[PDB]
Protein backbone atom coordinates (compact mmCIF):
# COMPACT_ATOMS: atom_id res chain seq x y z
CA UNK A 1 0.00 0.00 0.00
CA UNK A 2 1.33 3.42 -0.97
CA UNK A 3 0.77 5.87 1.88
CA UNK A 4 1.20 9.65 1.73
CA UNK A 5 0.43 11.87 4.72
CA UNK A 6 -0.13 15.62 4.53
CA UNK A 7 0.91 17.55 7.65
CA UNK A 8 -0.53 21.06 7.72
CA UNK A 9 0.25 23.82 10.21
CA UNK A 10 -1.78 26.87 11.22
CA UNK A 11 0.78 28.80 13.26
CA UNK A 12 0.41 32.53 13.90
CA UNK A 13 2.44 33.31 10.78
CA UNK A 14 1.51 34.69 7.35
CA UNK A 15 0.37 31.84 5.13
CA UNK A 16 2.25 31.19 1.90
CA UNK A 17 0.24 28.36 0.33
CA UNK A 18 -3.40 29.29 -0.15
CA UNK A 19 -6.61 28.10 -1.76
CA UNK A 20 -6.73 28.56 -5.53
CA UNK A 21 -7.19 32.28 -6.26
CA UNK A 22 -10.70 33.12 -4.99
CA UNK A 23 -10.00 36.85 -5.08
CA UNK A 24 -12.74 39.41 -5.73
CA UNK A 25 -11.89 42.97 -4.62
CA UNK A 26 -11.09 45.45 -1.83
CA UNK A 27 -13.19 48.16 -0.17
CA UNK A 28 -12.36 51.62 1.14
CA UNK A 29 -14.69 52.32 4.09
CA UNK A 30 -17.72 50.09 4.68
CA UNK A 31 -18.90 47.75 7.43
CA UNK A 32 -17.97 44.54 5.61
CA UNK A 33 -16.49 41.22 6.70
CA UNK A 34 -13.12 40.09 5.39
CA UNK A 35 -11.34 36.77 4.84
CA UNK A 36 -7.86 38.13 4.14
CA UNK A 37 -5.01 35.60 3.93
CA UNK A 38 -6.80 32.89 5.88
CA UNK A 39 -7.66 35.48 8.54
CA UNK A 40 -11.41 36.08 8.64
CA UNK A 41 -13.39 38.58 10.67
CA UNK A 42 -15.87 41.44 10.58
CA UNK A 43 -15.52 45.19 10.89
CA UNK A 44 -15.13 48.52 9.13
CA UNK A 45 -12.01 49.27 7.11
CA UNK A 46 -10.00 52.49 7.32
CA UNK A 47 -6.67 53.88 6.12
CA UNK A 48 -3.96 54.50 8.72
CA UNK A 49 -0.18 54.73 8.86
CA UNK A 50 2.18 52.34 10.63
CA UNK B 1 44.24 10.58 -0.74
CA UNK B 2 44.73 13.08 2.09
CA UNK B 3 47.67 15.13 3.36
CA UNK B 4 48.13 15.72 7.09
CA UNK B 5 49.30 19.27 7.90
CA UNK B 6 49.20 19.72 11.68
CA UNK B 7 51.36 21.46 14.28
CA UNK B 8 52.26 20.34 17.80
CA UNK B 9 51.66 23.81 19.32
CA UNK B 10 48.34 24.41 21.09
CA UNK B 11 47.19 27.36 23.20
CA UNK B 12 44.22 27.41 25.59
CA UNK B 13 41.45 29.90 24.78
CA UNK B 14 40.06 32.70 26.95
CA UNK B 15 36.66 34.19 27.79
CA UNK B 16 35.36 37.76 27.76
CA UNK B 17 32.33 39.63 29.05
CA UNK B 18 29.29 40.38 26.89
CA UNK B 19 26.38 42.74 27.56
CA UNK B 20 22.74 42.68 26.39
CA UNK B 21 22.35 40.49 23.29
CA UNK B 22 19.61 38.14 22.17
CA UNK B 23 16.61 40.44 21.73
CA UNK B 24 14.31 39.71 18.79
CA UNK B 25 10.60 39.87 18.07
CA UNK B 26 9.02 36.50 19.00
CA UNK B 27 6.66 36.49 16.01
CA UNK B 28 6.16 38.25 12.68
CA UNK B 29 3.08 40.04 14.08
CA UNK B 30 3.20 43.70 15.13
CA UNK B 31 2.42 45.27 18.50
CA UNK B 32 2.37 48.89 19.65
CA UNK B 33 2.70 50.35 23.17
CA UNK B 34 2.05 46.95 24.77
CA UNK B 35 4.27 44.94 27.10
CA UNK B 36 4.27 41.24 26.24
CA UNK B 37 5.79 38.15 27.82
CA UNK B 38 7.36 35.29 25.88
CA UNK B 39 8.92 31.88 26.51
CA UNK B 40 11.28 30.82 23.73
CA UNK B 41 14.93 30.60 22.66
CA UNK B 42 16.67 33.83 23.68
CA UNK B 43 20.06 34.71 25.15
CA UNK B 44 20.44 36.30 28.62
CA UNK B 45 21.28 39.95 29.27
CA UNK B 46 24.74 39.30 30.77
CA UNK B 47 26.91 36.49 29.42
CA UNK B 48 30.39 35.51 28.26
CA UNK B 49 31.90 34.96 24.81
CA UNK B 50 34.88 33.03 23.43
Gap between the Cα atoms of B44 and B24, Å rounded:
12
Q: What are phi and psi of A31, to 5 degrees?
A: -80, 90
**Which residues does B50 contact at the CB level (< 8 Å), separation at least 6?**
B13, B14, B15, B16
Q: Name the experimental technique.
A: cryo-EM
For residue A21, the distance in angstroms to the closest alpha carbon of chain B comes to: 24
In the Cβ-directed half-sphere of B7, how many Cα atoms lie within 13 Å? Answer: 3
Q: Are B31 and B38 in contact (CB under 8 A)?
A: no
Gap between the Cα atoms of A44 and A27, Å rounded:
10
Q: What is the per-residue DSSP string for A1-50?
A: -----------SS--SS-SS-------SS-EEEEEETTEEEEEE------
Q: Which residues 6-45 in chain A show a CB within 8 A of chain B?
A: 12-14
Element (H, E) at B15: none
Q: Chains A, B: CB contacts under 8 A, how many?
A: 7
Cα–Cα–Cα angle for B40, A38, A48, rounded to 5 degrees: 85
Gap between the Cα atoms of A50 and A27, Å rounded:
19
Amino acid sequence: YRVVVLSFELLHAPATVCGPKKSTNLVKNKCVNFNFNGLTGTGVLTESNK
Amino acid sequence: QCVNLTTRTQLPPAYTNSFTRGVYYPDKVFRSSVLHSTQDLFLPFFSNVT
